[model samples]
Target chain A: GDTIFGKIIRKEIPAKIIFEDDRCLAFHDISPQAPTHFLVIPKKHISQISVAEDDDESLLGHLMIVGKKCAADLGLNKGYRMVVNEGSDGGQSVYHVNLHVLGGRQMHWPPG
Target chain B: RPGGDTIFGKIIRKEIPAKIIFEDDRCLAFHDISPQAPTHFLVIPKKHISQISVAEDDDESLLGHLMIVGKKCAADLGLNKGYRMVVNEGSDGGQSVYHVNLHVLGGRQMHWPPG
Candidate 1:
């Protein structure tokens, strides 16, 4: 058995894997909303960011670093948007936390 | 003119009362007075800095730390199902607070074309 992102983390589930390291994994979203749609996930399977503890600081910060460099590596350097949807109202479909990195288009204001 | 009065600054200086969730030497997190979502919180830096576009190279770690703290605070608030983090840039990004902050929104199904 595996967790929300466990399948992807272990390469059991097929995703357009791009970024991977000791702390995190980056892959294309099964359903992408933008030209550049991918997820940066932590292997630990934490529920969400709000509850992250102090010890998890390095791992959390690493996600942002990977998201940034990955965006630029894919040529989204022109512009990009990072979104993390939490709970139901936040549109979080997975139990494990992940960062949505969207780019290759101009994001609108009053973001939903 | 304003005599250097930024609400976030006051909050950071302990001059104002806020439901602060996370506070360290680097940044602060608190609930937004006027929230747009079921769970809307904010993460701002202790030291005042403009928006990300104008942020300096030295601000890289500081800005990244904001995102980290924003996540931890949101989780503490019980946004386990999922959450949304948004940063308002300049005037067009619908920014109101001059201190620049990251918004973490969640608790229900968020709509599309989110701003």
Candidate 2:
């Protein structure tokens, strides 16, 4: 059995993959909120921080760049939030490194 | 017409009436005309560059500088507990204005699926 995300990456299932490069892939979430909801994922499957090395710097930077590009593509120019859920405690249910780009509405604070 | 031709450019030049909260050589912080939270501020670079897509490799330092300023402004506003920073990119992101800006928000609990 593979993770839901693993299937998406392998193209085993269908997802609206928005942006893809050598290092990362951006796709619309199956369930979206607001007008645009996309997830940016790194190709390298490092499940936890302990697995990340200094060589991963470029990959990390690439993910951030792609995340911003996707946000622009989604029309969140007025405002949008980029969130990376690190671990289970950090609200990360999946094991891959992914960023949620959310926008198209007024974003409040304290992030409940 | 007043301060160059750009919207935020005018504001940066002090030609527009913005409720400025913080400023320095690298950046300027001001309250949004329509605030999304109790503490809503827009942190912008003095130079008029529209959108992060236009940001170059050299702009990384400026990005870091903006975040630092955002932290300072948040602290000044007594948002020590928590805060969120956002930067909307292009048309799809609903970025109406061309100039790049960072939104610093706090003072209330933000929910997912923002409405």
Candidate 3:
């Protein structure tokens, strides 16, 4: 049930935390994929979106709400890309489900 | 009335022809006309919200439901390798459609800098 994110949540490791609430946490990605890139994750250890239960409905939506709020604060008002990678082919290196917020430039297509 | 009744709404109402893949009381899933990955489709809510940025607290449950539905669709489509869910907001994000839609792409490795 433990992932690197768990460490970040418990402060066992260090991260450039941008936002935190009772249910979730947001931080900047060490290796920036875009000019403005960060990840938002739930406090709960759901592992992946594939295993999210019905009770987690509010939590899931809350993540998106929080992501938008963070984007606003980060001045990503023009636009941004929200992504969730599931399984291996999805390029999910972390077991924990993360909502990737990528922005600060014109996003291209083929969305890979 | 900016995002009122998009092409997705027409598909929901059967006013436009689409390759409907999955449908329920709350949402609908369809294959994209032009596939980005080997397995590319879209899942959208029946209730028309412009984008995730504008979704209200009252719409939380519906928004969550979209993810669950998208997961189910992926499983049904045999994307066992995994998949990516993408949501683009505003023009700069490359959001061509006005209505909120979750893009499910799979069947190959998704690259980084997901643009």
Candidate 4:
């Protein structure tokens, strides 16, 4: 897949890289929603969580773990939020699978 | 052993108080004590999976059910415009308690590139 993430994974594009390893990476969002907004994604080219196979549980879970670590690394100690925008209604911009981490503010209730 | 539920388990067991919105054999949905949204509802599984990272591969269907209930919650809340579904993990990820729970947010204009 030639998604932007693929390019980033290949180091063929410019991304404000935050963390990386064999399975996934966390990076700054060019367009951030909060003071401590960022994203965590699996390097493997899965488009969305729904399409992921049973073999992908570890990979899916790794993304969550990475997001947690990324939050701690970012020093969002008070609290933070993680989200996945799947398809059009979910507010998905990129087809590549990624989870958003939002916080560093008085996070509102019911919606944001 | 599976991490026993300290809070959510109680919510599911009706041991703790919650604004439960939805329920079934496999999952449950309710309001957050410290909500992050006007309609911040948590869709949780009856099982004791620690977090999304802990979701078993075979629990794919279970995960799907969680998402479904989240959508249903959003719908019941009249979040017609849109809603954000979140599954936070660990302390940094805002996961205070163990057990995976989905956060459904709506009833406001959610910004772009959410965290």
Error of 2 at B51 (Å): 1.0
Which prediction has more favorable DockQ, 1 or 4? 1
Cα error, candidate 3, residue B69 (Å): 0.3
- Point to the candidate with the largest lDDT: 3
Chain B TM-score, candidates in order: 0.91, 0.91, 0.94, 0.90
Error of 4 at B5 (Å): 7.6
Q: Candidate 1 DockQ category?
A: acceptable
Residue-level lDDT tens digits of model 4 in A28-81: 987887898888888888886545655665566566667767776887776677
Each candidate's TM vs. the true structure?
0.71, 0.59, 0.96, 0.66
Model 1, residue A1: distance off in Å is: 6.9
Model 2 chain B poorest 10 in a row by lDDT: B106-115
Ordered by TM-score, highest first, the candidates read 3, 1, 4, 2
Give the runs in model 3 whose Cα sits over 4 Å from its true position: B1-3
- What ranges in model 4 sit over 4 Å off? B1-7, B14-41, B45-83, B88-100, B105-115
Clashes of each: 30, 16, 2, 13
lDDT of 2 by residue, A1-112 (tens): 3477888889999999999977788999887765677888877786633235546655654665777767767666565666544333234557776667877765444333
Expressed as tens digits, the lDDT of each residue in B1-115 for candidate 2 is 4223577888988777899999888788999888877888888888766777777655655665665677667778887545556666554355677887877777766555432
> Is model 2 an incorrect, acceptable, medium or high docking prediction?
incorrect
lDDT of 1 by residue, A27-66 (tens): 9888887787889998987886655666676676567667
Q: Alpha-carbon error at A62 in model 4, in Å? A: 0.8
Residue B87 of model 1 has an lDDT of 67
lDDT of 1 by residue, B1-115 (tens): 1112588888888788998888889898898898877888889888787554445556666766887777667667877776688865444345566776788887766776455
